[PDB]
From TrEMBL, chain A:
One biological process term in Gene Ontology: cytoplasmic translation
Protein name as catalogued: 60S ribosomal protein L8-like
UniProt-listed Gene3D superfamilies: 2.30.30.30, Nucleic acid-binding proteins, Ribosomal protein L2, domain 3
Statement: the UniProt record of this protein carries the keyword Ribonucleoprotein: yes
All residue ranges annotated as the Large ribosomal subunit protein uL2 RNA-binding domain in the record: 10-89
From TrEMBL, chain C:
Name of the protein this chain belongs to: Ribosomal protein L19
Region (Disordered): 3-31
Family per similarity comment: Belongs to the eukaryotic ribosomal protein eL19 family.
Comp. bias intervals (Basic residues): 3-29
Organism: Nicotiana tabacum (Common tobacco)
Sites where the protein binds Mg(2+): A33
Residues of the full protein shown: 55 to 107 of 214
From TrEMBL, chain D:
UniProt source species: Nicotiana tabacum
Keywords: Metal-binding, Ribonucleoprotein, Ribosomal protein, Zinc, Zinc-finger
InterPro entries xref list: Ribosomal_eL37/eL43 (IPR011331), Ribosomal_eL43 (IPR002674), Ribosomal_zn-bd (IPR011332)
The protein's name: 60S ribosomal protein L37a
Family to which the UniProt record says this protein belongs: Belongs to the eukaryotic ribosomal protein eL43 family.
GO molecular function: structural constituent of ribosome; zinc ion binding
Cellular component GO terms held in the UniProt record: cytosolic ribosome; ribonucleoprotein complex
Gene3D superfamilies cross-referenced by the UniProt entry: 2.20.25.30
Amino acids binding Zn(2+): C38, C41, C56, C59
GO terms of biological process kind: translation
From TrEMBL, chain E:
A molecular function GO annotation: structural constituent of ribosome
Family the entry assigns: Belongs to the eukaryotic ribosomal protein eL38 family.
Keywords annotated in UniProt: Ribonucleoprotein, Ribosomal protein
GO annotation terms (biological process): protein-RNA complex assembly; translation
Protein name per its UniProtKB record: 60S ribosomal protein L38
Superkingdom of origin: Eukaryota
Provenance organism: Nicotiana tabacum
GO CC terms of this entry: cytosolic large ribosomal subunit
Gene: LOC107815038
Amino acid sequence: GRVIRAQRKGAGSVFKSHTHHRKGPAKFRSLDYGERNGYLKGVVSEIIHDPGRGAPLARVTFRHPFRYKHQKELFVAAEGMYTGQFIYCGKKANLMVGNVLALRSIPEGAVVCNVEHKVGDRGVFARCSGDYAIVISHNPDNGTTRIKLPSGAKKIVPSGCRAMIGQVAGGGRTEKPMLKAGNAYHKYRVKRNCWPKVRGVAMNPVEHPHGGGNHQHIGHASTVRRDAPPGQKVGLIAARRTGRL
Amino acid sequence: VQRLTYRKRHSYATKSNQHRVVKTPGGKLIYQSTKKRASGPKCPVTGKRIQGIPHLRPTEYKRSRLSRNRRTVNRAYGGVLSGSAVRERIIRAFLVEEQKIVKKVLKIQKAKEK
Amino acid sequence: TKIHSRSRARRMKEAKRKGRHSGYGKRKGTREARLPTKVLWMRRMRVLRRLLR
Amino acid sequence: TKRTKKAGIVGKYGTRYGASLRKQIKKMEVSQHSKYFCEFCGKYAVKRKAVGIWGCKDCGKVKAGGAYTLNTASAVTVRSTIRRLREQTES
Amino acid sequence: PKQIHEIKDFLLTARRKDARTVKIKKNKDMVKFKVRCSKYLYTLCVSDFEKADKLKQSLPPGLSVQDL
RNA sequence: GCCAACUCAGAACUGGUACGGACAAGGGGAAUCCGACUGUUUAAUUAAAACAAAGCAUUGCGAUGGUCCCUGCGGAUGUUU
RNA sequence: GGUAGUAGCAAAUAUUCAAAUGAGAACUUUGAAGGCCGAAGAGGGGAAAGGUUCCAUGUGAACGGCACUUGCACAUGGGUUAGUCGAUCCUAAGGGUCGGGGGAACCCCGACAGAUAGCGCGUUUCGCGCGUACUCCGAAAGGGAAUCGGGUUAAAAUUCCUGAACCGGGACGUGGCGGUUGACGGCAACGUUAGGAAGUCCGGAGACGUCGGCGGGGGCCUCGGGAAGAGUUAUCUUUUCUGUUUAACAGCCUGCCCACCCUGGAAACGACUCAGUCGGAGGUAGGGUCCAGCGGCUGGAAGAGCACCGCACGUCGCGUGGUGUCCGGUGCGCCCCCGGCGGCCCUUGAAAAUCCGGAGGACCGAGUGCCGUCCACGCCCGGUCGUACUCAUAACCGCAUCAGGUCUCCAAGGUGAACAGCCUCUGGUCGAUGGAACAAUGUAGGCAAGGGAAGUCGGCAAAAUGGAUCCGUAACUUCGGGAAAAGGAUUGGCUCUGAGGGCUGG
RNA sequence: GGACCCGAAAGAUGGUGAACUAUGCCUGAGCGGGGCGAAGCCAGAGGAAACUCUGGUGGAGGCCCGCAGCGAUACUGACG
Ligand SMILES: [K+]
Ligand SMILES: [K+]
Ligand SMILES: [K+]
Ligand SMILES: [K+]
Ligand SMILES: [K+]
Ligand SMILES: [K+]
Ligand SMILES: [K+]
Ligand SMILES: [K+]
Ligand SMILES: [K+]
Ligand SMILES: [K+]
Ligand SMILES: [K+]
Ligand SMILES: [K+]
Ligand SMILES: [K+]
Ligand SMILES: [K+]
Ligand SMILES: [K+]
Ligand SMILES: [K+]
Ligand SMILES: [K+]
Ligand SMILES: [K+]
Ligand SMILES: [K+]
Ligand SMILES: [K+]
Ligand SMILES: [K+]
Ligand SMILES: [K+]
Ligand SMILES: [K+]
Ligand SMILES: [K+]
Ligand SMILES: [K+]
Ligand SMILES: [K+]
Ligand SMILES: [K+]
Ligand SMILES: [Mg+2]
Ligand SMILES: [Mg+2]
Ligand SMILES: [Mg+2]
Ligand SMILES: [Mg+2]
Ligand SMILES: [Mg+2]
Ligand SMILES: [Mg+2]
Ligand SMILES: [Mg+2]
Ligand SMILES: [Mg+2]
Ligand SMILES: [Mg+2]
Ligand SMILES: [Mg+2]
Ligand SMILES: [Mg+2]
Ligand SMILES: [Mg+2]
Ligand SMILES: [Mg+2]
Ligand SMILES: [Mg+2]
Ligand SMILES: [Mg+2]
Ligand SMILES: [Zn+2]
């Protein structure tokens, strides 16, 4: 008869993201004439740590195309980039790690990261540490390109979408065991209030479908409907299968 | 062994509530407020301190409070860039311009040949 | 002011400097707590390095 | 004297977390706290600042690398693949 | 407070309009001449008493003089 | 030559064997059950073998999306991938 | 009403003697003695909260669980002084909003559906150029313009008095500085009180976690000598005790640990820290620049404060005079600040106001006066509100003058590893209604011959062990532990011996 | 219909509290003295070599004894 924890997540106010010390969103430059037709040079000024994010971020300074001022940007750092390196963004940029190129100019089999979904969205795919996308094939007829996402899914995107050559830096982070609850506490302290987690069978019936009973047990199949209403949809949602491979 | 009390209505030992113990001509100890330690100007290229400028609070650098010689360095980018950084910038500018001229003349010669 | 003399403390200091009241029955802290070996090592290093210089 | 037979750096954990986990984390503990060769200045002065960030104490260059090593294994393969593709395109 | 190291500068300071009073203090080893101006009190230290007497004689007539 | 500090280690002598003289300050050992451990919990009868935990495994989801809040409009995750 | 003058007044070691006042004194005041708090206090201040409880005089009744001459009660009066301490300013998590979108409507979302506020230059006050939809609230602990001694009240003070400084703003005058129109010096790091400049642009400070070692500074503690006063003196004691001071601010000097510059070119590698580390990307070495200072000297400033010794009025001179305030040592000592390294992170540990600097050079002046000038001196002004007091075993909350609860600053000597326990100095205090007796039963604290868990559901409770030094330490084990395993020996006082250092001088 | 008088556990509607407590966020503050001795580093010994060993230095840990702080196991003590 009580709202369950998963339901209470949506309202927020204690489950909102912790973003006080973050350095701002990481994204490409806004797509403009120079990047659409030629190339624009930038210089990496700093590689910084973004709290709550495994991948490091790189500060890049560009010369504004038509204003007398500096154009400052914050890119997701690709492995191998360094302070003082020159970064080239555009259709005519060379195929080197760190450069941002339109997918039409990236040959098949290349390794890219922070791939745009819509032309000009400034990067949504393959952004986490150690992740990358692979260019599969190009379709000149309809101006679309096929890529392989980190999850293994194959997606078709317009060939005008941009991507950064190389893989995201910071790879191999998750292979290290934490060994203790304190490390997880520190990890999630900067992400959101999602830890520790209480098992549903440890609760009373009033606050979870798994609650209750003189023994700890679910008492009914943990696989639930895709259309099950909130508060009832707990456990393995719309599972096509369960158990080991 | 005289024991002291805060001179102001601040009752917590924060960074801005620092003090020193001074002996007055009256023979008694007393607190006196001391400003927080501040880092002086720093060179963004090398990250090291800028020589010739004292380390004061930002308001202590005001023109009406500090002499001009104390807050200036007689060189291009004086007080902003270190000497080595300025030298590197000058050399880089000169050499890059020279290489630009070399590229232009090479392109002109190649065009003439063809 | 009420009398609180230091004469006994000074006499005890003299006796200690003569080596009195320093036996195993007069020690409560460990040898480390009484005098850390780190302090002795630092002293020896400073002395020997100064002599070498 | 040989202070530990085999523990080495993981001796700080005492008898906690299990032998297998200590052995597994020993590799990361050694690698992330070690010095790495700097290509730019030719010195063994590259130290990890934060996960994925590696700065050189000598020349001051900062590089984005692996979480616990300066260069991940896949980084070299990615560089080789990109070089091959660039050479094919240029040719 | 500021110290004047020359009798000439001391006389120059005493001659200006905003000099209010002059105070003379007799110490064992020297004589101190103090001039009260708008912003600062200027003190001149004279080691020899003969030159101190000459300076006292040389004080402008219109400046008040007090002995300490 | 002039100064300097308290640490350590020995040797005599000596007291009614007292002497960490008050104070201060582990009892120890051989096994069984449970929980790995540190941590947390029923404010005012239960501190535990209960909760959490690192580790292990499963499920949904590539944004025209997964989960969730909202009368509606719109929102949290999301400065995210 | 009976209960009943009954249950009770029992935690926080403790009072005693003489005198004064008073009708009345175990409870008020003075002096003496004996004790306690024992610097992570029963001491000295603040934040919140309270609101006059603060100070003086007086006091019938009530109240202060006995009493009162008394008082945090009652009555009459008095008391809170700021350009410098705060609010005020900035922004944090967030709050409140325009427009727009919803909504029967109270209202909901909140810069997201949009002709933003405005900001600079010259002026016939009009022109030109920039202009991304909140210029609002939000910290008496975050950021931040400026004050210090000395003195003063019954009760206020960094606010009042005296003296001496500083900050912000405004306007001019004098002098100085530049014109090679926009200074000079140094090879350099950089130095000098001055020493062009508009739209535009750029950097820095503000500005940041935690732990460990080391080093510097200020205060405290501590040892010795000189002088001043006091305590002991049957005996000894050149001995015991007290105090022997120097603020903001201005100038000059100095120059920690780093950082930087010049000469030079290194293996027989060297330099170097407690630990590290550094060097042909230029070490060692020699010579320099800069940075901190809560460092030194001087002015302030001895005229002040303190201590001591005198003269005088002797009812009301807040009177008058002298002497001194000196010279050294020491440190894993304690509090605070700073410097520089190192460890830790799948944790990397605010923003803005504000201030400083820089890139560029449109534009700008004269010949005995003009144009500039962040230089020195001179002149004027600085609003509003808070400010008493308590901050707690009676001034807040807990129905109370309740052994509970309530954030924080300072922190002496001895023993001892030690803000452990125990004793002491400054400061505070003897406030817990008193008297007599010492039955049972209780509460709290001990001891007990022989036996040693036979008691009990159960070793509950108590006892035993305990610090430090030396010897020694099993099974098992994830090799990290177990471990202080277990098991043995020693410990006082006195008189000595040995070892472990610094400065100066060829 | 209040229906002789007094009485429910409940139900509905509309408002008020996070000064206690629970959790997230922002900004401040606080935490003796000792024990064990991980990485890194210095030196020496043994050995044909491989390599092994010894003595120092250093100070890691959701490590240990323990003061303050925080909490509350037993006496099933006192009080009740
Ligand atoms: K419900
Ligand atoms: K949580
Ligand atoms: K769980
Ligand atoms: K169940
Ligand atoms: K189960
Ligand atoms: K300067
Ligand atoms: K613990
Ligand atoms: K536990
Ligand atoms: K427990
Ligand atoms: K559990
Ligand atoms: K969504
Ligand atoms: K009376
Ligand atoms: K509307
Ligand atoms: K809005
Ligand atoms: K403030
Ligand atoms: K004053
Ligand atoms: K801050
Ligand atoms: K650090
Ligand atoms: K000051
Ligand atoms: K300029
Ligand atoms: K006041
Ligand atoms: K208060
Ligand atoms: K028994
Ligand atoms: K039994
Ligand atoms: K009826
Ligand atoms: K509260
Ligand atoms: K907090
Ligand atoms: Mg189960
Ligand atoms: Mg000690
Ligand atoms: Mg809807
Ligand atoms: Mg304390
Ligand atoms: Mg009173
Ligand atoms: Mg509207
Ligand atoms: Mg404003
Ligand atoms: Mg530590
Ligand atoms: Mg001492
Ligand atoms: Mg005097
Ligand atoms: Mg210029
Ligand atoms: Mg009330
Ligand atoms: Mg001691
Ligand atoms: Mg609250
Ligand atoms: Mg314990
Ligand atoms: Zn390098």
